[PDB]
């Protein structure tokens, strides 16, 4: 047993002093801090006139433009970078948007799950597009039992299909959501 009144080394020492590496793996995970990442704060520097100095930060014209796509006052420069900003340097992209966005004071933010599984499930079945799939459901909600076609498609709801739309934790409350359809 435990030698009672001896000093117990920390769990790192316990795992490390044992060639049991699965516990050492648990020891390293204790410092993961992946929830404590960074992400942007360059947009805030764009509309605040702050020394961003991106270089190593993850720059995405896809994203950085689409964030200013919500604010219509920043849209003239976003419309330009959409036009001619293709093939323009990342460092140049932030530098153009520096003197291009008006004032700063970074602001707020920027179609549901149980519908979007049916829409994407009808789309793959009949090999149609989103637009066509969306209309299919809307007409099927009105007519010859959409509940019937839900059962026709209970077999091809794989976890690869599911997790592809909303990973998080829903694709398990959605996996066995459309289970009860018989």
């Amino acid at each position: 047993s435990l030698f009672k009144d001896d000093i117990q080394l920390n769990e790192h020492q316990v795992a490390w002093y044992s060639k049991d590496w699965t516990a050492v793996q648990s020891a390293a995970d204790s410092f993961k801090e992946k929830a404590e990442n960074e992400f942007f704060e360059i947009i805030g520097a764009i509309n605040n006139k702050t020394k961003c100095s991106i270089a190593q930060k993850d720059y995405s014209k896809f994203m950085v433009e689409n964030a200013l796509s919500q604010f219509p006052e920043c849209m003239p420069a976003v419309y330009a970078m959409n036009l001619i900003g293709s093939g323009l340097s990342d460092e140049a992209h932030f530098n153009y948007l520096m003197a291009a966005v008006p004032r700063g004071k970074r602001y707020g933010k920027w179609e549901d799950s149980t519908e979007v599984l049916i829409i994407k499930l009808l789309a793959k079945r009949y090999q149609v597009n989103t637009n066509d799939a969306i209309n299919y459901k809307s007409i099927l909600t009105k007519n010859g039992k959409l509940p019937l076609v839900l059962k026709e498609l209970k077999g091809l709801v794989t976890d690869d299909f599911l997790k592809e739309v909303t990973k998080n934790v829903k694709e398990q409350k959605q996996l066995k959501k459309l289970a009860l359809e018989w």
């Binding site: 490390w16 050492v24 093939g87 340097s89």
Partner: protein
Amino acid sequence: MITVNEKEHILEQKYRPSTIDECILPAFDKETFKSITSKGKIPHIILHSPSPGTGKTTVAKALCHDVNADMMFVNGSDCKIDFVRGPLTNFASAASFDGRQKVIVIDEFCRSGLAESQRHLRSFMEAYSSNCSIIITANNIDGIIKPLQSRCRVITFGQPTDEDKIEMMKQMIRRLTEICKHEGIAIADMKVVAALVKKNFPDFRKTIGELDSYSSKGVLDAGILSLVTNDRGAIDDVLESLKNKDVKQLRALAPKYAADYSWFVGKLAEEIYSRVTPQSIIRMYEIVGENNQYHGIAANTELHLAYLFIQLACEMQWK
């Protein structure tokens, strides 16, 4: 008087300092190292500076040599997970019959996908830190996970105060003098070495190398001075002709860069961003980015590049 590694031939490492007192650091940092060596045991230290060649790996080795430590030097890129659990633990748990402090230098540790090995190192520092210590030398400090900086003593290199910079450059001007004394290089003009140290400062590896490249004559006459002060070019002729609105030279420089259009347009945007006024920064990236957008659509690429030159000359308010 300078430590030489008489098997090196490469200058930039033949005269790599051996001790802290041979290193050129800011006075507080240099004092903080001499005190860390005086206290016997090395703490967990992260030496970092984004500008390379400031003294990181030298000081890391100088601390191990001053203390006379059983140093395990490792290339941080080969410091994978099976390494931290492998030869790292085997060394940390070795018997220190010698009494010298076991210290592991992980050179160039900041890396992309070494995350699992990086957190393992943190958890490793709760077990075997009783025995050994770890010196980290990195360029990007962020490439290092936050738990390590939380534990390690982070000493930022290459960020000196003004008074610290002045004394450091003066020390370096004396170093390159003692290099030229020991290598066989004649210092005909002392303003060469001063401009050598000053032009490329914080990188001490690069300025020693530049002395090697300018030692091709064996003497540092004022001609070599005119070389070091010659601010080179890249595309200095186009920037010059754009500020002067010289339509003749823009007309003759467009066939010069129509060959490598995509590089030149990118290099031109980089250079004008510094030389042009802020209200012109808007029109600059719009004129260039549009010209590059239609690159290849334009039938004559040379004339299209002259079009960029004329468009910039008329629209750029210069500094």
